[PDB]
Amino acid sequence: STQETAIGNFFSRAGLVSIITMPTTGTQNTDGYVNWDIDLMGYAQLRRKCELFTYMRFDAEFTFVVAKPNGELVPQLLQYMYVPPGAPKPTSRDSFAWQTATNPSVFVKMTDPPAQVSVPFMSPASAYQWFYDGYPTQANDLDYGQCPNNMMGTFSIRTVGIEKSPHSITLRVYMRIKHVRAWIPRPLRNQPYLFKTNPNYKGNDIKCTSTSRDKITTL
Amino acid sequence: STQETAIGNFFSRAGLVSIITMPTTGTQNTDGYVNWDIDLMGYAQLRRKCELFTYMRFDAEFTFVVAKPNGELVPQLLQYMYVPPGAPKPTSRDSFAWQTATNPSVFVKMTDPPAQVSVPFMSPASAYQWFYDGYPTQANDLDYGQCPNNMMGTFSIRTVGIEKSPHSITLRVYMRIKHVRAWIPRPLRNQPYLFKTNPNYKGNDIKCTSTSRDKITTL
Amino acid sequence: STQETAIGNFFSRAGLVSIITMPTTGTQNTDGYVNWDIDLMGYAQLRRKCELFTYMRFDAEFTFVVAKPNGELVPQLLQYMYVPPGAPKPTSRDSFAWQTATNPSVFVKMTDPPAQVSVPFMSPASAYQWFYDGYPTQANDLDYGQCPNNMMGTFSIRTVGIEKSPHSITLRVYMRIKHVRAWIPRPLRNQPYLFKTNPNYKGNDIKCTSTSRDKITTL
Amino acid sequence: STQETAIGNFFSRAGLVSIITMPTTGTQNTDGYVNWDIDLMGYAQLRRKCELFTYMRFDAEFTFVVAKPNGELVPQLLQYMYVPPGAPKPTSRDSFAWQTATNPSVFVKMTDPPAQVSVPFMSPASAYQWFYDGYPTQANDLDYGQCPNNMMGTFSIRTVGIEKSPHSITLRVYMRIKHVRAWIPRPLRNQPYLFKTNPNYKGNDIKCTSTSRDKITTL
Amino acid sequence: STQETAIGNFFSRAGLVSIITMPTTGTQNTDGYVNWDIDLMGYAQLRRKCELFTYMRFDAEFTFVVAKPNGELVPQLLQYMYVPPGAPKPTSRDSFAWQTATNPSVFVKMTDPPAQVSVPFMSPASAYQWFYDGYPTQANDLDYGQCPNNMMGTFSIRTVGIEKSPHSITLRVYMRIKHVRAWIPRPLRNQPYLFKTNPNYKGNDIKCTSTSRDKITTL
């Protein structure tokens, strides 16, 4: 069936896009909260799939699978807050940001089944674009290829309550692309990725698209 | 879309309107209960938004997010009682008020998902009014601008059971305005608020509506 | 709206009609069960409301709010049995009565949300009557005004299991009157109540229906 | 209403038909399982009701109310297996019988609300019969009145898991007769029952159907 | 009724197809995960039933009944991942395989009721075949009768979380055949099975299809 090769089926399925960890005390948790900016170019697997196209438009479904680091669940009340683009992100475990009515928040117990929410098409432009041959502001670093109109928002996680939580939390964020539309197909990345924000490739070790053989007649 | 600028969308979304805390023993809890009169002029954020209009009419949806102070949940049975206007409020952890059939009460376990209830348009007048240029009873303090026809009711929280609860409770009250209607738009508050019940402003430090610059030509 | 003054709205709302307590061991609990005969003339508040009419007919909805005496809930299996009129009531924590198919019983865990059940119009007569100027069998005590055709049934509560429960239980019984019909309105009780089963009033201290004043002209 | 005297209403309502107890260790539980053959002639109350008719046909609804002996519930996974007639019953806590696809089994946690299942009309004959004036194979004991075509099946209870359960279990089995049909009404048992499988009565102490009085004129 | 002898009814009902055990530490669990390739020829009971036909086509419903080895349940988050045919299976408790979007995974708590999922008809051929009189690649062992087009997939179980789970898990996998279709009926296996992948039988001890008797006239 040709349905299997349709843009939609190719970009369906919820995949893991991030793994936030909030230990009781260690390196980055005397805070008590986390700010994860929604990022797709996170996993090279999904990134390569997207960079097959120049422009894309879609909705995103997020599912929040949390539990303690060993898999155990406890009666802990959590809060996930979506900070749209152009909005101020929490800077402390108790910033005013957490009370701002305009930053939709979802409250759920770690015992309750995973929370699920859908985020629309945020760009101010007609489509997200993985490639911008210009500057949003010149030969050159910093400020090139960067298109801020792809900014999808930020998710701020934290345990509820005035005192810090006794439990460490390991949260897995899954995302599913709904209603996909793609434009202008381009060559498939054949060089290892070096950065999230640009096509730079290792220029000394340029790998060949295909494996080799001895003679052009041996097969 | 113009829908985004519609009165309804502007006043939608559930925001935090109050944070009640009932510790086992400290300052105000050898009682075991709390009486929160429904108050909107609580958070200056929402208050400024309302004082953009003279009269407003609407329904209110209340959601009760509770848990212990650190975010943990325990099998504690709670009772939230709505004491309408003109009704007697509980004066002790065990007043008759808690048994009065006419004071609707909702019983829920701290484990159960947040309780949610809708309160109608209580005023005896056609609309709530954030400004009353008269007296409900004269140059002058006390008894001015005060309109008792805006009184929306009181919520009385307490743990159920004859003995006091072993757990401390931190309850967050969220409110959402439904079916909003507004009349007679007025200037937007440009001076810091000094009191909940009146427009008094600091008259020595009168802030300018806009920032300044050197010359009227430098830009 | 006149709807607010309608017999139905006047007698709606679930009110507390009884508070049964079953401690592990104290005065009346080496038993392990309780027999509460359904009684409305329990709370003078609701009683006065009913004695505004001579005859009344209605269905009753019962809700069972239970928890330990301090409000905590535990995984305890309880059984509530309705013993109709003319049926034999349990006389021990393990009478045959608890197994009698004809005594409908509802089993629920103290963790599960409150059990709710509806009891119909039990009287063998066309309506319940709060006043019977005769004898069911003469100037006179005992056997007067007593109409057994108002007998609505009994509720027998107990913890399930062959051994006694480790936990103390405090159960609140709420009742709501559905489909109300009233006949022959009568004067409103103006003297304090002395007994559940009769209009006897303190005859030495007869209180006046209204407060007093000095002169009939001072106001 | 005549509806109350209808065969259906007379045989409705779920009654207790059995009480299985599986202690950790005592007399009959170093096993870890129980085999209860579905038996109606268990409780003389229901038995007398059935023997008012010669033939009966009906479906049966079974509800499984379990908990520890004191009424407490714990996170124990149980398995109830229905072994139809002509099928092999488990002979050990781990017989192959428990894995046989054809023996429908229902898995439920003691925390989950009571399991409920419906068993159809199993007899190979058109109706169950409480009386068979013949032999299924002669004056005489053993092998008389016994009709094996009334065999409804067996229920095998056990805790899941390879190791024995730490908890003792007391399970109450309730049964409700659905879609009842009865034929050929007969005299009502007036002598105490002596056995489950036959009408034998104590012949020395033959009780009179009615109480006595002195003279045939005194009343 | 002939419905009882229909291919569908004959192959219905969920039966146990596998019992995976993941102890904290013992022989095969310092790993923390398990890879069970979906196998029907597991239980000789069901296998014999299938080998009554040459070709079969059907969907499969899998139910995952898990709990600790003694039947107790704990708040443990588990993950069941379906690795289709031609896909790479996890090789460690934390392989990339567990993050691969294309390997559908279902997350469920051991407290939640058993997870249930349906797997379609995976073969690249029109039907699964329990007999292939050829080679997929000759008199002869290894590489005969083996048809890889019957490969249905693999299920990879594991506890979620970065650290190993404190609890041992015993998981029972039930399978139900939906929408069955069978072709070309063949003789029923009358010799004990020796291997999962071939009809080899013990040739010294060849058992007779029927029991014996003395004379051909004694009955």
PDB file of N, CA and C in Angstrom, chain D residues 91-138:
ATOM      1  N   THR D  91      -5.756 -29.797  40.679  1.00  0.00           N
ATOM      2  CA  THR D  91      -5.496 -30.714  41.790  1.00  0.00           C
ATOM      3  C   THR D  91      -4.340 -30.247  42.652  1.00  0.00           C
ATOM      4  N   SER D  92      -3.747 -29.126  42.264  1.00  0.00           N
ATOM      5  CA  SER D  92      -2.634 -28.550  42.999  1.00  0.00           C
ATOM      6  C   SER D  92      -2.656 -27.070  42.722  1.00  0.00           C
ATOM      7  N   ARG D  93      -1.902 -26.309  43.505  1.00  0.00           N
ATOM      8  CA  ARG D  93      -1.852 -24.869  43.321  1.00  0.00           C
ATOM      9  C   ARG D  93      -1.299 -24.500  41.939  1.00  0.00           C
ATOM     10  N   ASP D  94      -0.700 -25.472  41.251  1.00  0.00           N
ATOM     11  CA  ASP D  94      -0.109 -25.224  39.937  1.00  0.00           C
ATOM     12  C   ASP D  94      -0.363 -26.296  38.858  1.00  0.00           C
ATOM     13  N   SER D  95      -1.540 -26.915  38.876  1.00  0.00           N
ATOM     14  CA  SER D  95      -1.890 -27.941  37.895  1.00  0.00           C
ATOM     15  C   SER D  95      -1.876 -27.325  36.481  1.00  0.00           C
ATOM     16  N   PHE D  96      -1.943 -28.147  35.438  1.00  0.00           N
ATOM     17  CA  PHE D  96      -1.964 -27.608  34.073  1.00  0.00           C
ATOM     18  C   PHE D  96      -3.318 -26.922  33.897  1.00  0.00           C
ATOM     19  N   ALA D  97      -4.318 -27.422  34.620  1.00  0.00           N
ATOM     20  CA  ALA D  97      -5.685 -26.903  34.568  1.00  0.00           C
ATOM     21  C   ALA D  97      -5.778 -25.385  34.553  1.00  0.00           C
ATOM     22  N   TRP D  98      -4.899 -24.731  35.301  1.00  0.00           N
ATOM     23  CA  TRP D  98      -4.891 -23.273  35.389  1.00  0.00           C
ATOM     24  C   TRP D  98      -4.442 -22.590  34.103  1.00  0.00           C
ATOM     25  N   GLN D  99      -3.844 -23.345  33.187  1.00  0.00           N
ATOM     26  CA  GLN D  99      -3.364 -22.782  31.930  1.00  0.00           C
ATOM     27  C   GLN D  99      -4.246 -23.145  30.749  1.00  0.00           C
ATOM     28  N   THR D 100      -5.171 -24.081  30.962  1.00  0.00           N
ATOM     29  CA  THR D 100      -6.077 -24.540  29.908  1.00  0.00           C
ATOM     30  C   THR D 100      -6.986 -23.441  29.359  1.00  0.00           C
ATOM     31  N   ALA D 101      -6.732 -23.030  28.114  1.00  0.00           N
ATOM     32  CA  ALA D 101      -7.488 -21.962  27.455  1.00  0.00           C
ATOM     33  C   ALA D 101      -9.006 -22.079  27.545  1.00  0.00           C
ATOM     34  N   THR D 102      -9.510 -23.311  27.489  1.00  0.00           N
ATOM     35  CA  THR D 102     -10.949 -23.588  27.540  1.00  0.00           C
ATOM     36  C   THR D 102     -11.617 -23.371  28.901  1.00  0.00           C
ATOM     37  N   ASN D 103     -10.829 -23.200  29.959  1.00  0.00           N
ATOM     38  CA  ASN D 103     -11.405 -22.922  31.269  1.00  0.00           C
ATOM     39  C   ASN D 103     -11.283 -21.415  31.377  1.00  0.00           C
ATOM     40  N   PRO D 104     -12.372 -20.698  31.064  1.00  0.00           N
ATOM     41  CA  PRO D 104     -12.304 -19.243  31.149  1.00  0.00           C
ATOM     42  C   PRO D 104     -11.845 -18.827  32.531  1.00  0.00           C
ATOM     43  N   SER D 105     -10.963 -17.834  32.587  1.00  0.00           N
ATOM     44  CA  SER D 105     -10.456 -17.338  33.860  1.00  0.00           C
ATOM     45  C   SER D 105     -10.569 -15.821  33.864  1.00  0.00           C
ATOM     46  N   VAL D 106     -10.782 -15.244  35.042  1.00  0.00           N
ATOM     47  CA  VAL D 106     -10.851 -13.792  35.178  1.00  0.00           C
ATOM     48  C   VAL D 106      -9.801 -13.390  36.207  1.00  0.00           C
ATOM     49  N   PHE D 107      -8.940 -12.455  35.826  1.00  0.00           N
ATOM     50  CA  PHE D 107      -7.897 -11.968  36.707  1.00  0.00           C
ATOM     51  C   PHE D 107      -8.294 -10.608  37.240  1.00  0.00           C
ATOM     52  N   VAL D 108      -8.198 -10.437  38.550  1.00  0.00           N
ATOM     53  CA  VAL D 108      -8.541  -9.166  39.144  1.00  0.00           C
ATOM     54  C   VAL D 108      -7.738  -8.938  40.422  1.00  0.00           C
ATOM     55  N   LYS D 109      -7.505  -7.670  40.750  1.00  0.00           N
ATOM     56  CA  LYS D 109      -6.758  -7.296  41.943  1.00  0.00           C
ATOM     57  C   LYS D 109      -7.782  -7.157  43.067  1.00  0.00           C
ATOM     58  N   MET D 110      -7.387  -7.523  44.283  1.00  0.00           N
ATOM     59  CA  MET D 110      -8.276  -7.427  45.437  1.00  0.00           C
ATOM     60  C   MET D 110      -8.667  -5.966  45.697  1.00  0.00           C
ATOM     61  N   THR D 111      -7.918  -5.045  45.094  1.00  0.00           N
ATOM     62  CA  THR D 111      -8.176  -3.613  45.219  1.00  0.00           C
ATOM     63  C   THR D 111      -9.269  -3.188  44.236  1.00  0.00           C
ATOM     64  N   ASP D 112      -9.241  -3.773  43.039  1.00  0.00           N
ATOM     65  CA  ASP D 112     -10.242  -3.495  42.013  1.00  0.00           C
ATOM     66  C   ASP D 112     -11.641  -3.816  42.594  1.00  0.00           C
ATOM     67  N   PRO D 113     -12.704  -3.191  42.056  1.00  0.00           N
ATOM     68  CA  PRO D 113     -14.036  -3.503  42.584  1.00  0.00           C
ATOM     69  C   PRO D 113     -14.377  -4.954  42.235  1.00  0.00           C
ATOM     70  N   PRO D 114     -15.235  -5.590  43.042  1.00  0.00           N
ATOM     71  CA  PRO D 114     -15.630  -6.991  42.829  1.00  0.00           C
ATOM     72  C   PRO D 114     -15.829  -7.424  41.394  1.00  0.00           C
ATOM     73  N   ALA D 115     -15.282  -8.587  41.067  1.00  0.00           N
ATOM     74  CA  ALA D 115     -15.419  -9.127  39.725  1.00  0.00           C
ATOM     75  C   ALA D 115     -16.838  -9.662  39.580  1.00  0.00           C
ATOM     76  N   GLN D 116     -17.374  -9.592  38.367  1.00  0.00           N
ATOM     77  CA  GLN D 116     -18.734 -10.055  38.111  1.00  0.00           C
ATOM     78  C   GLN D 116     -18.767 -10.781  36.776  1.00  0.00           C
ATOM     79  N   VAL D 117     -19.440 -11.922  36.757  1.00  0.00           N
ATOM     80  CA  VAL D 117     -19.514 -12.741  35.561  1.00  0.00           C
ATOM     81  C   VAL D 117     -20.850 -13.462  35.500  1.00  0.00           C
ATOM     82  N   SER D 118     -21.331 -13.718  34.283  1.00  0.00           N
ATOM     83  CA  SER D 118     -22.599 -14.429  34.084  1.00  0.00           C
ATOM     84  C   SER D 118     -22.384 -15.837  33.509  1.00  0.00           C
ATOM     85  N   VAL D 119     -23.027 -16.830  34.123  1.00  0.00           N
ATOM     86  CA  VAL D 119     -22.940 -18.228  33.683  1.00  0.00           C
ATOM     87  C   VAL D 119     -24.295 -18.619  33.108  1.00  0.00           C
ATOM     88  N   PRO D 120     -24.316 -19.142  31.874  1.00  0.00           N
ATOM     89  CA  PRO D 120     -25.575 -19.535  31.239  1.00  0.00           C
ATOM     90  C   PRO D 120     -26.274 -20.797  31.752  1.00  0.00           C
ATOM     91  N   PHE D 121     -27.180 -21.307  30.930  1.00  0.00           N
ATOM     92  CA  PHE D 121     -27.908 -22.514  31.268  1.00  0.00           C
ATOM     93  C   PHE D 121     -27.116 -23.715  30.743  1.00  0.00           C
ATOM     94  N   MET D 122     -26.326 -24.290  31.641  1.00  0.00           N
ATOM     95  CA  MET D 122     -25.443 -25.394  31.316  1.00  0.00           C
ATOM     96  C   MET D 122     -26.033 -26.773  31.039  1.00  0.00           C
ATOM     97  N   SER D 123     -27.142 -27.109  31.680  1.00  0.00           N
ATOM     98  CA  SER D 123     -27.700 -28.437  31.470  1.00  0.00           C
ATOM     99  C   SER D 123     -27.868 -28.822  30.016  1.00  0.00           C
ATOM    100  N   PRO D 124     -27.693 -30.120  29.724  1.00  0.00           N
ATOM    101  CA  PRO D 124     -27.822 -30.718  28.394  1.00  0.00           C
ATOM    102  C   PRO D 124     -29.301 -31.011  28.147  1.00  0.00           C
ATOM    103  N   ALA D 125     -30.096 -30.839  29.208  1.00  0.00           N
ATOM    104  CA  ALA D 125     -31.544 -31.034  29.164  1.00  0.00           C
ATOM    105  C   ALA D 125     -32.203 -29.645  29.074  1.00  0.00           C
ATOM    106  N   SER D 126     -33.503 -29.599  28.815  1.00  0.00           N
ATOM    107  CA  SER D 126     -34.192 -28.318  28.674  1.00  0.00           C
ATOM    108  C   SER D 126     -34.333 -27.500  29.937  1.00  0.00           C
ATOM    109  N   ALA D 127     -34.113 -28.126  31.093  1.00  0.00           N
ATOM    110  CA  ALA D 127     -34.222 -27.422  32.372  1.00  0.00           C
ATOM    111  C   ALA D 127     -33.534 -28.155  33.510  1.00  0.00           C
ATOM    112  N   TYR D 128     -33.189 -27.413  34.557  1.00  0.00           N
ATOM    113  CA  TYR D 128     -32.565 -28.026  35.719  1.00  0.00           C
ATOM    114  C   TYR D 128     -33.775 -28.650  36.422  1.00  0.00           C
ATOM    115  N   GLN D 129     -33.571 -29.739  37.157  1.00  0.00           N
ATOM    116  CA  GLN D 129     -34.676 -30.361  37.888  1.00  0.00           C
ATOM    117  C   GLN D 129     -34.204 -30.732  39.281  1.00  0.00           C
ATOM    118  N   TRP D 130     -34.919 -30.245  40.291  1.00  0.00           N
ATOM    119  CA  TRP D 130     -34.563 -30.490  41.681  1.00  0.00           C
ATOM    120  C   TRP D 130     -35.047 -31.838  42.169  1.00  0.00           C
ATOM    121  N   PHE D 131     -35.752 -32.563  41.296  1.00  0.00           N
ATOM    122  CA  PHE D 131     -36.277 -33.886  41.625  1.00  0.00           C
ATOM    123  C   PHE D 131     -36.226 -34.849  40.445  1.00  0.00           C
ATOM    124  N   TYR D 132     -35.581 -35.996  40.653  1.00  0.00           N
ATOM    125  CA  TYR D 132     -35.459 -37.041  39.632  1.00  0.00           C
ATOM    126  C   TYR D 132     -35.871 -38.352  40.324  1.00  0.00           C
ATOM    127  N   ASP D 133     -37.060 -38.860  39.996  1.00  0.00           N
ATOM    128  CA  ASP D 133     -37.609 -40.085  40.591  1.00  0.00           C
ATOM    129  C   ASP D 133     -37.024 -41.352  39.991  1.00  0.00           C
ATOM    130  N   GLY D 134     -35.810 -41.239  39.479  1.00  0.00           N
ATOM    131  CA  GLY D 134     -35.175 -42.396  38.898  1.00  0.00           C
ATOM    132  C   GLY D 134     -33.729 -42.534  39.325  1.00  0.00           C
ATOM    133  N   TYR D 135     -32.972 -43.262  38.511  1.00  0.00           N
ATOM    134  CA  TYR D 135     -31.559 -43.501  38.754  1.00  0.00           C
ATOM    135  C   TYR D 135     -30.810 -43.215  37.451  1.00  0.00           C
ATOM    136  N   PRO D 136     -29.621 -42.583  37.530  1.00  0.00           N
ATOM    137  CA  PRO D 136     -28.859 -42.176  36.349  1.00  0.00           C
ATOM    138  C   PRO D 136     -28.020 -43.310  35.780  1.00  0.00           C
ATOM    139  N   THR D 137     -28.269 -44.540  36.276  1.00  0.00           N
ATOM    140  CA  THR D 137     -27.445 -45.699  36.094  1.00  0.00           C
ATOM    141  C   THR D 137     -28.381 -46.881  35.915  1.00  0.00           C
ATOM    142  N   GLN D 138     -32.414 -51.457  44.279  1.00  0.00           N
ATOM    143  CA  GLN D 138     -33.250 -50.351  44.119  1.00  0.00           C
ATOM    144  C   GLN D 138     -34.344 -50.441  45.138  1.00  0.00           C
TER     145      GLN D 138
END
